[PDB]
């Protein structure tokens, strides 16, 4: 806590169910390393019975900001 970790993020890929909608996050990755970090989470479910997916900062367009 000091910058911004997981406090409000849209999705922008167009495949991902809650795509353009902004729900909440969690333990976003630490290290330099990989390509699929970030958990996100929101109320609304989706086509599977369980939906709580991990997208990745190449993107999260949050966008402003």
């Amino acid at each position: 806590i000091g910058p911004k970790r997981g406090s409000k993020v849209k999705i922008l890929r167009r495949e991902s169910y809650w795509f353009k909608n902004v729900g909440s996050v969690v333990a976003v990755d630490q290290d330099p390393k990989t390509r699929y970090p970030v958990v996100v989470r929101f109320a609304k479910v989706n086509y599977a019975n369980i939906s709580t997916n991990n997208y990745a900062l190449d993107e999260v367009e949050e966008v402003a900001a």
């Binding site: 495949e15 390393k33 990989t34 699929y36 599977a48 991990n54």
Partner: protein
Amino acid sequence: MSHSVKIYDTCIGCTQCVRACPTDVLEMIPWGGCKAKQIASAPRTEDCVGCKRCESACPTDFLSVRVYLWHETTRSMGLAY
């Protein structure tokens, strides 16, 4: 394609996730870093029929497979007999 339905996802972890599907899917082939580190989308698929039992469980987050193979043996449908 001749069995080409994409169930891929991103975790490709397979614990309380997915196993079901007659023979086809001998995976756990850990790619150099993807969390529970077992990955990809299949093994040698020239063996069994056309499920989508394939997802039904454990994410594909996009599509999920079904029939799309067309070129379709028989061993690839129960009935060659």
